[PDB]
Every structure is written in structure tokens, then in C-alpha cells.
Amino acid sequence: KRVPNPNFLGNCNIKDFKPPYI
Amino acid sequence: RDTRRKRRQGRSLPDIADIPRTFRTPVPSTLMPGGVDVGPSVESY
């Protein structure tokens, strides 16, 4: 069972925060 | 013992004939050519 590191393509810890109008 | 005879006839310096080679112990580096691939992997597991 593999577990992805935070340095994986698409598995960052910095989630995209959305603006209030969206 | 070479220097033991430099003094006897000198009573009465770099060796340019021994040209050393460049072997290097490999650095533990993944990508670079010339280094062993120990340590953290290319894949992130």
C-alpha cells in the first residue's frame, strides 16, 4: 500500500482557497 | 629513504613523474551522474 508524500504531483498541503464572490 | 639520500650528496620538491589519477568517492545524489542513488527516492512514497 503506497502512501503519497506532500511532494507529490497533486497532493500538496496548501489547499486552494476560494474568493468570496465565487 | 629517498630523502635519506638527498642529504648525503647534498652535504657534498614535487615528483613530476608521478601524475595522479582522479578517482572520486560518489556523493549520495539521486539525479547527478557519478553518484550513488541512496536516500530519498524519485517517486514520493
From Swiss-Prot, chain A:
* Localization per Swiss-Prot or TrEMBL: Nucleus
Q: Which residues cross the membrane?
A: none
Organism domain of life? Eukaryota
Function text: Involved in transcriptional activation. Component of the SWI/SNF complex, an ATP-dependent chromatin remodeling complex, which is required for the positive and negative regulation of gene expression of a large number of genes. It changes chromatin structure by altering DNA-histone contacts within a nucleosome, leading eventually to a change in nucleosome position, thus facilitating or repressing binding of gene-specific transcription factors.
Q: Which family does it belong to?
A: Belongs to the RSC7/SWP82 family. SWP82 subfamily.
Q: Subunit notes for this chain?
A: Interacts with SWI3 and SNF12. Component of the SWI/SNF global transcription activator complex. The 1.14 MDa SWI/SNF complex is composed of 11 different subunits: one copy each of SWI1, SNF2/SWI2, SNF5, SNF12/SWP73, ARP7/SWP61, ARP9/SWP59; two copies each of SWI3, SNF6, SNF11, SWP82; and three copies of TAF14/SWP29.
The name on file for this protein is: SWI/SNF global transcription activator complex subunit SWP82
Q: Name the lineage.
A: Eukaryota, Fungi, Dikarya, Ascomycota, Saccharomycotina
Curated annotation (Swiss-Prot), chain B:
What parts of the sequence cross the membrane? none
Q: Where is the composition biased (Basic residues)?
A: 4-12
**Origin, by domain of life?**
Eukaryota
Localization, UniProt: Nucleus
Disulphide bonds in the chain: none
Q: How does it assemble?
A: Component of the SWI/SNF global transcription activator complex. The 1.14 MDa SWI/SNF complex is composed of 11 different subunits: one copy each of SWI1, SNF2/SWI2, SNF5, SNF12/SWP73, ARP7/SWP61, ARP9/SWP59; two copies each of SWI3, SNF6, SNF11, SWP82; and three copies of TAF14/SWP29.
What is the protein's known function?
Involved in transcriptional activation. Component of the SWI/SNF complex, an ATP-dependent chromatin-remodeling complex, which is required for the positive and negative regulation of gene expression of a large number of genes. It changes chromatin structure by altering DNA-histone contacts within a nucleosome, leading eventually to a change in nucleosome position, thus facilitating or repressing binding of gene-specific transcription factors.
What more is known? Present with 217 molecules/cell in log phase SD medium.
Assigned protein family: Belongs to the SNF5 family.
> Know the name of this protein?
SWI/SNF chromatin-remodeling complex subunit SNF5
Q: Which organism is it from?
A: Saccharomyces cerevisiae (strain ATCC 204508 / S288c) (Baker's yeast)
